[PDB]
Amino acid sequence: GRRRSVQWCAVSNPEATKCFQWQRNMRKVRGPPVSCLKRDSPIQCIQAIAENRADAVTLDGGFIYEAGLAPYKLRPVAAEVYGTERQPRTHYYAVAVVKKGGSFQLNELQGLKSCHTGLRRTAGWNVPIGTLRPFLNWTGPPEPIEAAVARFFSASCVPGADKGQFPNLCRLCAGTGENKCAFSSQEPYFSYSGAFKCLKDGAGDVAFIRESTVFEDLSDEAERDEYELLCPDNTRKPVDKFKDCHLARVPSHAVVARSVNGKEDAIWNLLRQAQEKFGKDKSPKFQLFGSPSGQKDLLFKDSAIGFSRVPPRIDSGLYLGSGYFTAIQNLRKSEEEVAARRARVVWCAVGEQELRKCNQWSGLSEGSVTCSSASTTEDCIALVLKGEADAMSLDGGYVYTAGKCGLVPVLAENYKSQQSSDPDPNCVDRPVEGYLAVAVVRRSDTSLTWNSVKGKKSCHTAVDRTAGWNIPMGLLFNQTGSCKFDEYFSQSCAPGSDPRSNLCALCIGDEQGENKCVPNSNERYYGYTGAFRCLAENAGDVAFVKDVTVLQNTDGNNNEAWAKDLKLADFALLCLDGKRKPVTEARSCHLAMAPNHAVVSRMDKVERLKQVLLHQQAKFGRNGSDCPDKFCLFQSETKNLLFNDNTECLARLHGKTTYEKYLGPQYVAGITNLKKCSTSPLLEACEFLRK
Numbered sequence: 001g002r003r004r005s006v007q008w009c010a011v012s013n014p015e016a017t018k019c020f021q022w023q024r025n026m027r028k029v030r031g032p033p034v035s036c037l038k039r040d041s042p043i044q045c046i047q048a049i050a051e052n053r054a055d056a057v058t059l060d061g062g063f064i065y066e067a068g069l070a071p072y073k074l075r076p077v078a079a080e081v082y083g084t085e086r087q088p089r090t091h092y093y094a095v096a097v098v099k100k101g102g103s104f105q106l107n108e109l110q111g112l113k114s115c116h117t118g119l120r121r122t123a124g125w126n127v128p129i130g131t132l133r134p135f136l137n138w139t140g141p142p143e144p145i146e147a148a149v150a151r152f153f154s155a156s157c158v159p160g161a162d163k164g165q166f167p168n169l170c171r172l173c174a175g176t177g178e179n180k181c182a183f184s185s186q187e188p189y190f191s192y193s194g195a196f197k198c199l200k201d202g203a204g205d206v207a208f209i210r211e212s213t214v215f216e217d218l219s220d221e222a223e224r225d226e227y228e229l230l231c232p233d234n235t236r237k238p239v240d241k242f243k244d245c246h247l248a249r250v251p252s253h254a255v256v257a258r259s260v261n262g263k264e265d266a267i268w269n270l271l272r273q274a275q276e277k278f279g280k281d282k283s284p285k286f287q288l289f290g291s292p293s294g295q296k297d298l299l300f301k302d303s304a305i306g307f308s309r310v311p312p313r314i315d316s317g318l319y320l321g322s323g324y325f326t327a328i329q330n331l332r333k334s335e336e337e338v339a340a341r342r343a344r345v346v347w348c349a350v351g352e353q354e355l356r357k358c359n360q361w362s363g364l365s366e367g368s369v370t371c372s373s374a375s376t377t378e379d380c381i382a383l384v385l386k387g388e389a390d391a392m393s394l395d396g397g398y399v400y401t402a403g404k405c406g407l408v409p410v411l412a413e414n415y416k417s418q419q420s421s422d423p424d425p426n427c428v429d430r431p432v433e434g435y436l437a438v439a440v441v442r443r444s445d446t447s448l449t450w451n452s453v454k455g456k457k458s459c460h461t462a463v464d465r466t467a468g469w470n471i472p473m474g475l476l477f478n479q480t481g482s483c484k485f486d487e488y489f490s491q492s493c494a495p496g497s498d499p500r501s502n503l504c505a506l507c508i509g510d511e512q513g514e515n516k517c518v519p520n521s522n523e524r525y526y527g528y529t530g531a532f533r534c535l536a537e538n539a540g541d542v543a544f545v546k547d548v549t550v551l552q553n554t555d556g557n558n559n560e561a562w563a564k565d566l567k568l569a570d571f572a573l574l575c576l577d578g579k580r581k582p583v584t585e586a587r588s589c590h591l592a593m594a595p596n597h598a599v600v601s602r603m604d605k606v607e608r609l610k611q612v613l614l615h616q617q618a619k620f621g622r623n624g625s626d627c628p629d630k631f632c633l634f635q636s637e638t639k640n641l642l643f644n645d646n647t648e649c650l651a652r653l654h655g656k657t658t659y660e661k662y663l664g665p666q667y668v669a670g671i672t673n674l675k676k677c678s679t680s681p682l683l684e685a686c687e688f689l690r691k
């Protein structure tokens with residue numbers, strides 16, 4: 001014997017106590033069971049959990065950060081919900097409270113006295129210190145920002161600060177003895193309520209807390225009136241103007257568990273039942289979101305209204321946000337190092353071949369481009385959200401996903417026009433024309449037509465790209481109305497599907513029979529060239545590609561082994577009408593017009609990304625000053641690494657700077673429908689992070 005429960009990590013006595021009561025009432029209702037572990041702080045809870053001696057603990061975004069780092073790598077599993085029942089939210093506001101009577105704004109705090117919730121806390125430290133960075137005159141590492149803050153304000157209360165080294169910072173703490181400035185209840189000016197008390201008692205001039213404290217601690221309304229908020233536009237507004245007067249909107253506290261053998265189920269079952277039974281006003285036996293007249297926020301935030309489960313794709317950095325995550329990292333960086341990182345463009349390369357070319361581009365960018373890599377597009381989009389990568393060129397199917405995630409289209413791949421000019425000097429403002437999606441078959445299969453394609457073997461670029469999957473499956477879906485995308489064709493090579501499905505049946509992995517059905521250039525049947533090879537080698541009977549693919553790959557246009565003897569004349573296109581036409585008539589024989597591949601980024605990098613890309617292609621583009629002498633960005637010769645080998649240039653968007661404006665209504669309308677049949681972990685993660 002041992003236990004059978006979820007072991008909660010208490011970080012204090014009054015917390016072990018309530019944990020205990022929580023344990024009792026779980027039993028006494030025959031609900032899921034919680035056992036309790038004891039520690040003196042959040043980090044100890046972090047390590048206990050990582051060594052398996054507690055299962056979970058609810059932490060402040062500052063400790064979510066900390067906890068994600070190796071060697072811990074804990075993951076947020078359930079977020080606290082605040083606001084109300086019908087105006088519930090998984091975020092809170094970092095505000096700056098002051099008393100009415102003075103007139104000093106957020107830019108005039110030097111030499112004032114401040115009250116903070118705790119060292120490394122979202123609203124008490126990370127946000128305000130980051131907001132005042134520009135007035136601290138901090139020289140950067142190795143002098144801790146602390147020393148810069150200790151010099152900036154006169155005296156402060158900042159629980160957990162090193163009293164030895166940053167005496168000024170513990171200055172205002174009320175604790176008696178070795179308790180003065182503790183990161184615990186011993187220290188009365190601790191957490192939100194202590195920080196507020198600090199201000200209320202007249203000890204500090206500003207309190208750095210959440211929007212709710214004043215309303216939780218001050219009953220009377222007119223009591224509340226003695227205070228006001230310090231807004232970031234150096235204006236003062238009432239404590240109720242938080243939505244229009246906050247330093248930041250940050251993620252709510254969250255329960256973190258191990259990323260490995262986590263017990264997320266358990267934790268989620270326990271939490272769910274507990275909030276049913278013991279939640280917001282509904283069981284005087286026990287109250288999961290209330291604390292003894294002693295206490296404040298024991299185990300969970302007082303007055304949270306419940307839990308919201310975190311989609312399994314979310315890690316600390318996606319939980320935290322590009323914004324907040326980066327802001328925490330920056331606190332440990334010189335401002336030159338921070339300014340260099342913003343000037344630099346970090347490319348996300350999908351697989352090894354693309355990383356190779358990126359390295360090559362990198363060494364020649366004169367430090368303006370650097371590389372990052374993932375093994376799928378979704379992993380690359382997850383690195384750009386985390387701010388660890390910045391850009392990649394994507395298929396319109398990916399433009400939608402990135403877009404539901406908050407990324408915007410910056411420049412689009414411009415291909416040879418419906419002919420406007422020749423080696424076109426205005427390829428940059430020339431509006432994009434789209435690409436044609438076509439179904440290619442062997443000329444000799446005289447019998448094969450659009451209406452007899454179903455049930456045969458197919459070859460697709462990858463799951464979720466326009467020509468290779470949204471178009472063909474969309475068109476099919478629209479007739480049958482079946483979500484069983486694996487019965488449309490009997491055997492396929494659709495990279496990114498279950499390696500065990502029929503949809504991976506014809507894939508061949510790399511040169512060695514590995515990487516079977518992976519959605520990166522590791523699989524030989526991947527992307528446009530690879531969907532085509534699949535056909536040219538009688539693996540499949542149809543290949544969903546773009547017209548240009550066959551030209552580029554037959555008639556010695558490609559002389560890779562497999563391509564060498566193919567002749568354009570052995571292939572034909574299936575038209576919707578039941579006909580068949582030669583490849584040269586794709587203009588009047590296509591499934592549909594696909595939106596151009598586009599490079600996407602975070603909104604914060606748009607302008608610098610534009611700058612960089614216009615300059616780099618000027619040098620390495622099509623009739624680029626260094627190409628082919630030195631480097632051609634738009635050539636990997638039939639492999640389309642980073643960009644399509646046929647990009648004439650990167651063109652402006654002509655105001656379609658939204659995935660919806662860029663993709664168009666029919667288009668969004670259609671991936672939406674297809675997406676119901678099944679969503680991805682990644683749209684599930686952003687659905688959550690958007691809210």
Ligand SMILES: *[C@@H]1O[C@H](CO)[C@@H](O)[C@H](O)[C@H]1NC(C)=O
Pocket residue numbers: 110135136137151152
């Ligand atoms: C920041 O630097 C400026 C001078 O260039 C100065 O006015 C200010 O006092 C400095 N910093 C502190 C102590 O916050």
Ligand SMILES: O=C([O-])C(=O)[O-]
Pocket residue numbers: 395461462465466467468469527528544545594
């Ligand atoms: O459109 C497609 O199929 C692609 O870009 O792979």
Ligand SMILES: [Cu+2]
Pocket residue numbers: 060061121122123253
């Ligand atoms: Cu907090």
Ligand SMILES: [Cu+2]
Pocket residue numbers: 395396465466467594597
């Ligand atoms: Cu495409």
